[PDB]
Design a protein around this ligand. Structure first.
Ligand SMILES: OB(O)c1ccc2cc[nH]c2c1
Ligand SMILES: OB(O)c1ccc2cc[nH]c2c1
Lengths: 211, 211
């Protein structure tokens, strides 16, 4: 039902998620995740994936000729091409819900100072392209962002406001701290009102932006 | 010199962290199986929630014993959660000069709140969200935090605009001519404008605008 292809110079980084897929979902053909080494599409004996930036500056830029060949082979007209980058649109739960009904995601993982912009611009003339940031911080490359996106999207695939407040379980008293007595009261309308107020307080303290 | 301890019921999920820094040896990262601290033959770590609700909650008893052994009063205890304070670049800079991080990874519907409250009587505790989306547990968040922090350890605003490298013409698409001009002032000005242009389109909040 959904195919995900990931392209990276560090394919071992994605082995965790591959193994973590439920066997029943793979057997039922609901999901398939494949990982590809970008160096398969290099042109030279030194397997070069990067080169110096035009206009000067620090670091290196990933080569358009290598990426163009990789995406030509892996993508089709139905592909949603996902490019993690700290300069992207924000990736949120709404994004995850939208992508959860797609037939084919391809995730292009960059390194160094990113991928030559002509790769995305060319791809966008024949498929849908989405440059996205998973948060306001800088990573070394796109692989950890790909793990986050794969997890958040696939858990919404059929088969595979305010902040939530505190949770409790047994025992009822632990290291001098008792579970809030209202949760043991059997008054379920009161419990719901108590949880709402805990959620309001936590949102004011930790995420005033949400209000 | 930093030490990072990660506690989880899925230690195998943390092996992408062998993308080193660790090789250099200024940082040490160790992964611990929470089930090591259980006592029953079935190694139970979870129980149904007080007050009702779907799912299960991780028991405080097992976590308390694990953290007793791993943490000291100097530890910064990090707890990934969708209900946390935001983890940002500023957070990453702050944590980059810490001697000891311990990252407690939850599963199910999270960890009994008394674990963090008890720990806070002895050490500094930080509940944090890496972004506005829901994962299946804290492990992918741990990987994101480790990468954002370690790249800042000594010895290791606006959005970045587009980058380019050779060849100067590819598939009929040209690198912006100013980047080939060798005029540092004109290049700096073009780049500044591309960045502010990308920021208003993708992240207007960074410049104090709606949405
Ligand atoms: O911070 B991140 O979202 C991110 C994503 C992709 C690349 C490529 C090179 N650095 C990157 C950082
Ligand atoms: O979305 B996340 O930031 C996150 C973090 C921890 C847990 C534990 C259970 N679900 C979780 C989700």
């Amino acid at each position: 039902s959904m195919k995900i292809d990931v392209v990276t110079i560090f394919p071992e980084y994605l082995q965790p998620v591959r193994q973590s897929l439920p066997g029943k979902a793979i057997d039922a053909g609901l999901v398939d995740v494949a990982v590809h080494d970008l160096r398969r599409w290099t042109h030279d004996v030194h397997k070069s994936v990067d080169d110096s930036p035009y206009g000067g500056g620090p670091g290196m830029v990933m080569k358009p000729t290598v990426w163009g060949d990789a995406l030509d082979e892996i993508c089709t007209s139905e592909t949603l091409l996902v490019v993690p980058t700290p300069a992207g649109y924000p990736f949120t739960q709404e994004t995850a819900w939208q992508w959860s009904t797609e037939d084919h995601l391809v995730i292009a993982c960059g390194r160094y100072e990113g991928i030559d912009q002509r790769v995305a611009d060319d791809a966008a003339t024949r498929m849908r392209v989405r440059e996205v940031s998973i948060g306001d911080y800088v990573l070394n490359g796109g692989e950890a962002a790909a793990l986050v996106i794969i997890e958040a999207v696939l858990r919404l695939v059929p088969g595979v406001s305010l902040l939530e407040g505190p949770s409790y379980t047994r025992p009822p008293s632990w290291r001098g701290m008792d579970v809030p007595p209202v949760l043991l009261s059997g008054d379920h309308a009161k419990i719901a009102a108590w949880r709402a107020e805990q959620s309001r307080q936590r949102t004011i303290e930790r995420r005033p932006d949400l209000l």
